[PDB]
Amino acid sequence: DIQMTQSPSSLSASVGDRVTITCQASQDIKKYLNWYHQKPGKVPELLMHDASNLETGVPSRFSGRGSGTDFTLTISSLQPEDIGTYYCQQYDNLPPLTFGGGTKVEIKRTVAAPSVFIFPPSDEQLKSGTASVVCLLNNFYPREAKVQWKVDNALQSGNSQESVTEQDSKDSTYSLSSTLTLSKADYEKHKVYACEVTHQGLSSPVTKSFNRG
Amino acid sequence: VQLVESGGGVVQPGRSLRLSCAASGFSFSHYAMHWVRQAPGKGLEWVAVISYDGENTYYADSVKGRFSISRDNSKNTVSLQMNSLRPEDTALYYCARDRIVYYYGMDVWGQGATVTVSSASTKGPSVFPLAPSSGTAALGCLVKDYFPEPVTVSWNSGALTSGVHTFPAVLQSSGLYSLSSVVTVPSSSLGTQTYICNVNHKPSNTKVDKKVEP
């Protein structure tokens, strides 16, 4: 087939920046190249065809160049919603139709400390015989953050799971959830439940807690 | 212009599953139709294409003799019959529109169907409130113990989108998925405004509305 190689694999850039990504074909494809943009959680969107012709409705800050085997996509004024993955695609030959491996785009922004919230398990869940304690870290940057659980001042291990959102398409922040799961019997065996948070935007670790009942 | 997909869900390895895509808002019989798939966190992979009249079909080698693409230009539908499925077939599957100019490109995409190759049984979720308590407050819904992916969560029937974060599901040690959806709201709005999470898990046909109170 015709192998499509994209570069870089991923990048971080600021709002308003001029950014260029590269696509390379294993053999000459003239100008038979498409570019797609896939936002987090969304379907791919055709940005341009014939290497340089913008689809109708596509923002003017996108432009494509190149012919033969070497192509570029340039964003002249990076916007928060431009995050996600960009794919090139050749249509000089089919089958098979081939995509590049994709280039991931992240927004670099100012440091933002997380807002921290803790949620005790619902009475409804306790009826089932399981207790889920949830710690929420909201709208922070950068993505790196640590969450630790403490039950009656005892450090917890192996009984929690974390989930992190993709970067937000508006404010370029991340949100994080940590869920502590215990049996009902274990939950009622202890009084104070706390989650401790460390992050670049925090001078000291932030702790949120509650007492069962 | 719209492409609507259906037929996702669980399928045991070696077994069969059929995906379907319905078109509306354009002359469907004038366009070729692709299927493209995407593994979790991975890139786009072309699967198959069928010509406008259905006379020509092509397949990725990994699915050759395994998948079959077909269309009906009177019912405006394209179908992907998937046989003897493998763990590598677990992915989001898109159907996409195309037209001869050379295939122009895929300018219209379906929302995708999630196919999970597993011997695990389909289970609907339970939804628990994440109650707000003690200028900005946070509340949410815990969507626990379902299979397979995905579930969708909205708030107040979609009227509440600002400040909403629906986290990607995590696979629990039990083999079941769980996620949370949270919203930040003004604290003065508590006990004054109604917050309801709307949870949908199509594989188990489970539809739940949960009012979240302080």
Residue numbers in the entry:
A (entry chain L): 1 to 95, 95A, 96 to 212
B (entry chain H): 2 to 52, 52A, 53 to 82, 82A, 82B, 82C, 83 to 98, 100B, ...
Copy out sentences from the published article reporting this entry, exactly as the authors wrote them.
RSV F is a class I fusion protein that is initially synthesized as an inactive precursor. To facilitate virus entry, the mature F protein is triggered to undergo a transition from a metastable prefusion conformation to a stable postfusion conformation, resulting in fusion of the viral and host-cell membranes. Here we characterize AM14, a potent RSV neutralizing antibody that was previously isolated from human PBMCs, and show that it recognizes a novel quaternary epitope on the native trimeric prefusion conformation of RSV F. The epitope is evenly distributed across two protomers, causing AM14 to be uniquely trimer-specific and, surprisingly, cleavage-dependent.
To identify the epitope on prefusion RSV F recognized by AM14, the crystal structure of AM14 alone and in complex with prefusion F was determined. AM14 potently neutralized all RSV strains tested, with IC50s of 13.6 ng/ml for strain A Long, 12.4 ng/ml for strain A2, 30.8 ng/ml for subtype B strain 18537 and 4.6 ng/ml for subtype B strain 9320. In this experiment, AM14 bound tightly to prefusion RSV F derived from A and B subtypes with EC50s of 0.63 nM and 0.18 nM, respectively. In contrast, no binding to furin-cleaved postfusion F was detected. Therefore, although AM14 binds specifically to prefusion RSV F with sub-nanomolar affinity, its kinetics are much faster than those of other potent antibodies such as D25.
